Amino acid sequence: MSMVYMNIMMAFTVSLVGLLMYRSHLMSSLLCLEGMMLSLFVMAALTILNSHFTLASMMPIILLVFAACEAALGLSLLVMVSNTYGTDYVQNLNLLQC
Amino acid sequence: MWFEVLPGIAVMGVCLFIPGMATARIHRFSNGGKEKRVAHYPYQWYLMERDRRVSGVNRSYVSKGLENI
Amino acid sequence: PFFDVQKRLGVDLDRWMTIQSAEQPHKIPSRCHAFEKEWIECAHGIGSIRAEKECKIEFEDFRECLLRQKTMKRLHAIRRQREKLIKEGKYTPPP
């Protein structure tokens, strides 16, 4: 494939590994989730623009809109977690262990 | 008196006047004395590129008329 | 679709954007319009098991238009040869 696709897919893989390899902050993991969205938006836009798929030109916008709404829900969960424990550390979310 | 506020306003006005005046005259200087060509759409760019080849000096703003027919 | 409600009601909810050879604003064609049209017409109605074999020619051409893998490989071949000759003085490009 084209050379640009090498790096866009690499960016998605890098953010996916970042997402699956948590540290402590929940916000850091939410940023990786947005990173995957941004790489998906670029890969979709490049494919659609280069192929001149005219009606598909709106699809990246719909992706952006829906994923931003997803991120707003994710942020709201983060603040509720932070209100409970005083931080957004994932290690605090282990009650359902038992 | 109030008109002693005008000198500061005049300096401000001349300062805001230069950007627009400079761009207009620079465009004429760089485009053969005409307005800079606007190409927002592929059709306009296509005609501008065709003008560059037709000019014979690789300048889209150098026009050729009936003398080339 | 799992439940083909669209076809039952004759209403087009998302079919309009499924393929690039469908109707587009101002009749703007996709780059691979003719290749997608050919493949779709070859494989229409015969099922995907049959189409995977009987329409392989149209699909390979359509895939070549989509990603141009064979074209880029050919261009890479000619360019690489040209560098060698430039590196050996047996070729001078024209004007």
Next chain:
Amino acid sequence: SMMKWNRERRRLQIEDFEARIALMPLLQAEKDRRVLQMLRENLEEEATVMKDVPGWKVGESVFHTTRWVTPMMGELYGLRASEEVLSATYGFIWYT
């Protein structure tokens, strides 16, 4: 006032669009010859460059179909000075 002016502007756009339609046949004829000339020129250099490369047919299509296929940028400007390639690829996008 805005309605009257916008209707006039729509009439001015139709006149501008119809001038383009009058010229499109001439431009299309020119474009066809330029594309075919460029492809022909690349085919001569290919014959020279790939003369002593085994199993290389010169001008061989990569498609099974014999239909005419529009070339992509790399096919036309494959072997030309970067100044022209950059203008062809990114000139419009970059123009102001």
Next chain:
Amino acid sequence: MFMINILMLIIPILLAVAFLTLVERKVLGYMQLRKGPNVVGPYGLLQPIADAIKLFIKEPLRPATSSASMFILAPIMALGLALTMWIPLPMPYPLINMNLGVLFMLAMSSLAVYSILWSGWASNSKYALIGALRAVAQTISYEVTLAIILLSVLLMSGSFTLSTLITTQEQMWLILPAWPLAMMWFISTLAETNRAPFDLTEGESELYAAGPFALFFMAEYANIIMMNIFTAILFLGTSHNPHMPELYTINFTIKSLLLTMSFLWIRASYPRFRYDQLMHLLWKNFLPLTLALCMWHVSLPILTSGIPPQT
């Protein structure tokens, strides 16, 4: 030749900002029955120079910041973006002729809130961080109406190109068909630029220094001028004669000057909004009207048969 053009935009912008400080002080003075600067140079014409030099040779007292990179980033972002806002402005010819120029200005202006946020983080003080967040909330809130008002106007213009606003207003200023939007647009720019009666960053901290303070101030006043240049183009379109572009530049400058002076006029005339009150002015007053006028301006060209051309 193009680099000359860039400099001939940047330098006059910075000089106009400098002397707006003089003009603001003198206009405010005469509305307060006094004079304002009139000693440092004739009619105070050297006052901006003395202030600029003073600020830059002042001790740059920066407390040990929690982030060195974000302390430097905030002023660079603020000033860099402020100058960028000027490059698509047609006066009558833009430096950069963008097909989506209006959209470019909206997108760049939405980034200016990062300088507020980053400067809050770098302050290393929860009190200044809380002040930053209150300012960010005010700024994004009024971005909602600015975008919708702008969209409503463009439904009469037909495109996102800034120079097409000139064509749209060849016969008549857009303020006549759209004075309700011009009213809310104008107030929104005041709140956007944290200008009185929406200057709640200054008032609340009451109730940066030297060059770095000067840079944030320059960016603020560049934005103030640019907002009023935008308003003049959006609603008070000047006619352009292609053979005498300087007549456009004179008339359009006067309108922008007057609009900028009205910012100073308003600052002299009213008390300050409470924070919750300027939030209610947006969410409970401007936004309901802007939404209704947005619906109206979608329908109006269709129902009158006055849809503008795309090109």
Next chain:
Amino acid sequence: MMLYIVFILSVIFVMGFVGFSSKPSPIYGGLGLIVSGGVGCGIVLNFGGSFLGLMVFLIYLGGMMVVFGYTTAMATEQYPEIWLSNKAVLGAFVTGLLMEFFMVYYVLKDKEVEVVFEFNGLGDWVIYDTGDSGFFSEEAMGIAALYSYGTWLVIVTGWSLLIGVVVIMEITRG
């Protein structure tokens, strides 16, 4: 060369991703995403997507990323930790840059590389279209078609946004 602008931007794109994906302080991780967003817009711009490019700036960076930074300052980090101070972050950051540099170096030396899958390295311009002379933006035509063709898309998109408002008010009431 400017003939490799798209490739160069995509190299920076990846470096920004290795930046926040190594997960430093969420303040610096947010900066890495902002830089990646801007670089990503430039990549989309050079393929002819002016509107789509500006939406990333307007909505993704001026909208979502602003709210991310806003929320971070409130409920996560108020003062950044020194960047690359933690060994795990530095190891991850260095590893991603080392991988990226090798891809770039090898694809540039051979004008092609096989990192899992095989890519071409001649430059992205080679795949571009060679025949455009229409009096409009095709991307603009497609997006404008949301209101003629995409009635169903508008309904479900508008509904989801309204529900997002209702939902987030339920979540946060506590």
Next chain:
Amino acid sequence: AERVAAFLKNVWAKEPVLVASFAIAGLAVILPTLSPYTKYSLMINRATPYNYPVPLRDDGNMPDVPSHPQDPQGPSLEWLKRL
């Protein structure tokens, strides 16, 4: 009729901003259906020729298709010139 009139006077006195919003939004929804000019917006949009009008092969039985653009057959924009 009156209890509604007594309702409008109350909201006009208490919430003139909201009354204006709802009034404008109602006109935006209603007036397009009543306007006699709405039909012209459709025609003008269709009269704008964005792409080339590809000619038809003449098979000898198309008397309603002009042979020349200046012939009298085919759609006319005389209605638009007056508008």
Next chain:
Amino acid sequence: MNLMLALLTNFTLATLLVIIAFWLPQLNVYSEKGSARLPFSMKFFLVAITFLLFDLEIALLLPLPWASQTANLNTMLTMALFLIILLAVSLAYEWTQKGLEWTE
């Protein structure tokens, strides 16, 4: 190329002014003289989140000037009003649920 040069000039100059503003002669020879819940209302979160959702709606209204050029005006006008009305319903919901209040 021009836009890149303009952007590079604007931020390069901004950078130069900032650094020189920090490093100027001083004429002195003597020694010079964390991630928790910030005490900030949930109301300010809801403003930012409310702005985001309205901003996403605005993204969908932006194509309207181009959409008005369609021959399918009946569909286009119905969908434009639907989207704006839904935006108004969103505001009405926050308003009547005391989401726009600053007391308490």
Next chain:
Amino acid sequence: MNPIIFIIILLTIMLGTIIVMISSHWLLVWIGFEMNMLAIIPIMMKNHNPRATEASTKYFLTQSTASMLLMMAVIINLMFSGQWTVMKLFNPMASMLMTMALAMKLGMAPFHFWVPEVTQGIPLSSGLILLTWQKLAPMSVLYQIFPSINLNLILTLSVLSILIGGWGGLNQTQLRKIMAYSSIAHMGWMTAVLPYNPTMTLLNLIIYIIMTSTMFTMFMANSTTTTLSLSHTWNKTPIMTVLILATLLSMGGLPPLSGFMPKWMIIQEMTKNNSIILPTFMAITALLNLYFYMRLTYSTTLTMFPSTNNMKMKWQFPLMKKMTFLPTMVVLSTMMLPLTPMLSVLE
């Protein structure tokens, strides 16, 4: 939650699922999943406590990750075929990514860890939705893309799920965790037969939903969430203990009860394809499920556990919970085997 809002949120959970089921476009399928996940979170959060917040967060992270992977599969599919139609995918890497994403959405092993934890942390009514209605949309996509799924991948997921579900349930005293591990085991049967006969996937899904709804409804009727709390039912509602016994035996796949029918039919389809080891291994491994179902029957119906004195006060009040459709569902859950040939309606 305001009752009108609850209804609208529930209708949006259903609409998201329906959009997935009627869509012919991958983008609309993705939207359906996003809409569905948006509306489900509030009903997980509705009792406002740290356990519910942890459950909703773990759910959000799992589902949002899976939806990004699904979008990636769709886009790879677009690049290699230039179309969006919901059907077989045209790239093996796209097929794997979509299969893994749907496995994460279904909570199949080894992506199962979230199911027991999320189910434990939310109310019974919310857990009922999570383990029944929420399986419909991902299964309806597998139903359509199966011609291109990797056989080894899907059967590995099935085998792991049956093993993990059976073993995981052996160690549970919480009713919500038992149902969760039971769900993981049952998803394994549904997907094991998918490559061979998707109709049996639908049959197993439908019967699974009926039986699962019956159990949750009977747990809600008595407000029981633990094994010991359930063991007091005999002293309050003896009829309920019998209905639980029948439903548990049916869920254990014992003939002549309804739950035997899916296992019976799936074994038949697999053997017709000369798959003998896998069905036999599956059937024996499902005896682990039968074991911890039987344990519950012992402490609920077949013995009488100790009571408390305050239980007498409960004797003076009648059941007031809705128990909607419970009489119908319990009959279907147990007495349908004689109508097995009716499965052809699912063709």
